[PDB]
Design a protein around this ligand. Structure first.
Ligand code: ACO
Ligand code: ACO
Lengths: 168, 171
């Protein structure tokens, strides 16, 4: 049983818990053992901001009533760049490779298309993170550049990232 | 041929003049995310930003005063998580009136030297509109290479999307 819907402030405590869990599952994102470093009350503030924002959104995936994944679009408000959404997605490791990430990413893209503001979606992905690269390409993201020392892992060493975007 | 030059780290006391300068340059070009709305920060809010930059070991704001007035700024910004703590996002702007006299280069080099000495930053980066060739040139001169380009990186002229270069330097 799977529901995908937009985050509500009542999800804050459980979202913080989810993000601290996934922070310990991999080193593919900026999240590390220090976790999300946000209180449930800070996260409420965040989720309210996202919900009222015309060019930003947090969508949550629930598996039998518990959050199993999140996709985030954030965006700057200045007119130069307000049409650009920066994407972030993470799925609980035990649920990988069952299509949740594609489901969530497709919902995000649909929302972004409907927004009327967002005309570009983008992100940075570690080149070694081939699952992410493949998923993003599958949904029409292209590799737009590659950057040396785009990330630091394992207490020394530096690794490369790709930049990826999709026009909408 | 006569002038007075000071280059130094910004202090909270500079807040009002720095707000004034950033509002000035935001009206001179549409080459950066600055626009006619201006910097959108009061002198009081800038004073906070400026305390943080001075108090942070992987960030900095450097000012150039020409004849006692701010003529240019270089800004290094950075996240604090260890995944990305070594990456400084660079921003430079010079008053149009003072372009092509070497001021941009002096500031860029000072910023690079600080970044090198910090012991934390191992990469500098920015994005630059592909049409902003003065900027593309200035950065190449100081060892930045083009790592990519992004369609719709910027929106101008109420309806025109344009491309940006991703540019980077290892330090
Ligand atoms: C800024 C950001 O978005 S953060 C970067 C992305 N997030 C992360 O890296 C966090 C950790 N990882 C995750 O949360 C997940 O593994 C995600 C988000 C990458 C993928 O979530 P999932 O729900 O597993 O995705 P889903 O099942 O829809 O699809 C995975 C696809 O990758 C493929 N895949 C899995 N592992 C690999 C691999 N090592 N190499 C290539 N492809 C792979 C699968 O075959 C599948 O493709 P298909 O549908 O064509 O078969
Ligand atoms: C993220 C960011 O940094 S923002 C992007 C940069 N900032 C901006 O676009 C804001 C508006 N522009 C400016 O502030 C300035 O014009 C800057 C910062 C780009 C340059 O600063 P200046 O003080 O003019 O730089 P400086 O005089 O040291 O060097 C200018 C160089 O570009 C050259 N130049 C000037 N116009 C052009 C052009 N159209 N095409 C190519 N080169 C040019 C000059 O010849 C000189 O190069 P050289 O010394 O090798 O001959």
């Amino acid at each position: 049983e799977l529901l995908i819907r937009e985050a509500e402030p009542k999800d804050a405590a459980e979202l913080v818990a989810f993000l601290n869990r996934v922070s310990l599952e991999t080193d593919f994102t900026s999240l590390d053992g220090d976790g999300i470093l946000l209180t449930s009350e800070e996260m409420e503030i965040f989720l309210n901001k996202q919900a009222s924002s015309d060019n930003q959104i947090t969508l949550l995936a629930f598996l039998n009533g518990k959050i199993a994944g999140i996709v985030n679009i954030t965006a700057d408000q200045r007119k130069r760049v307000r049409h650009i959404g920066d994407l972030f997605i993470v799925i609980g490791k035990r649920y990988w490779n069952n299509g949740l990430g594609s489901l969530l990413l497709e919902e995000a893209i649909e929302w972004a298309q409907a927004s009327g503001i967002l005309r570009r979606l983008q992100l940075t992905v570690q080149t070694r993170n081939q699952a992410a690269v493949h998923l993003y390409q599958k949904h029409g993201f292209v590799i737009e550049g590659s950057q040396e020392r785009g990330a630091y892992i394992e207490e020394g060493k530096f690794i490369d990232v790709y930049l990826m975007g999709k026009l909408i």
